[PDB]
Amino acid sequence: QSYGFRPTYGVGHQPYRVVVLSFELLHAPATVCGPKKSTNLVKNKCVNF
Amino acid sequence: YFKIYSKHTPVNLGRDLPQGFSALEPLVDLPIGINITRFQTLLALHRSY
Numbered sequence: 001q002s003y004g005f006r007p008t009y010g011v012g013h014q015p016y017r018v019v020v021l022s023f024e025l026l027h028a029p030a031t032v033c034g035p036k037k038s039t040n041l042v043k044n045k046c047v048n049f
Numbered sequence: 050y051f052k053i054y055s056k057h058t059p060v061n062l063g064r065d066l067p068q069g070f071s072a073l074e075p076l077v078d079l080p081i082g083i084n085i086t087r088f089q090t091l092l093a094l095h096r097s098y
């Protein structure tokens with residue numbers, strides 16, 4: 001059935017876009033992963049590395 | 050995963066498996082998962098000699 005978009009119509013019939021994101025733990029290596037940015041480096045100071 | 054270790058060795062003169070020593074480095078991995086049970090290599094038969 002044709003949507004019949006109405007630009008002058010109020011809520012409901014106005015174009016609303018919905019997007020989905022499917023996440024699965026398939027038996028694959030790290031492919032889509034976001035790590036943290038590496039901080040600065042220090043020398044000659046006993047720290048946790 | 051399967052790693053393709055390879056060491057291009059041009060030192061050879063043409064003899065059948067000469068003596069020496071070498072080592073091979075990893076290139077890439079990829080998971081599939083199957084009872085392989087067999088292997089074969091096809092040939093670029095369009096130029097046969």
Ligand SMILES: *[C@@H]1O[C@H](CO)[C@@H](O)[C@H](O)[C@H]1NC(C)=O
Pocket residue numbers: 083084086
């Ligand atoms: C295991 O290997 C045999 C070898 O023929 C094959 O028939 C069978 O389907 C394999 N099983 C699985 C779960 O891959």
